[PDB]
């Protein structure tokens, strides 16, 4: 779910004297259908070849 | 040493709804010639005239 993308607003604080800037995001993520992938877990080994 | 002439910024508080005026300056002081100063101590005695 893809509720608002990255995006920036920015403000003045004269208490602080300087500018703050807030990036944001909104989103969500589940497994659709539990079927449709697999993982394979191997090793970091680079095969001996030739 | 000048960086930045005393300025006014201006913001607006709404929680506290009134300004909000900050005047700011930079600078640095130093010694420039160790050579062109000399200082006096002495007391604070008033003498008759």
Redesign the interface.
């Known amino acids: 779910l893809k509720s608002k993308m990255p995006s920036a607003e920015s403000d ?1 604080s ?2 602080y ?1 300087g500018d703050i800037v807030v990036n944001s995001m909104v989103y969500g993520a589940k497994l659709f259908r539990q079927t449709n992938a697999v993982i394979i877990n191997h090793n970091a080994v680079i095969p001996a070849v030739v």
């Open positions: 003045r004269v208490q004297l």
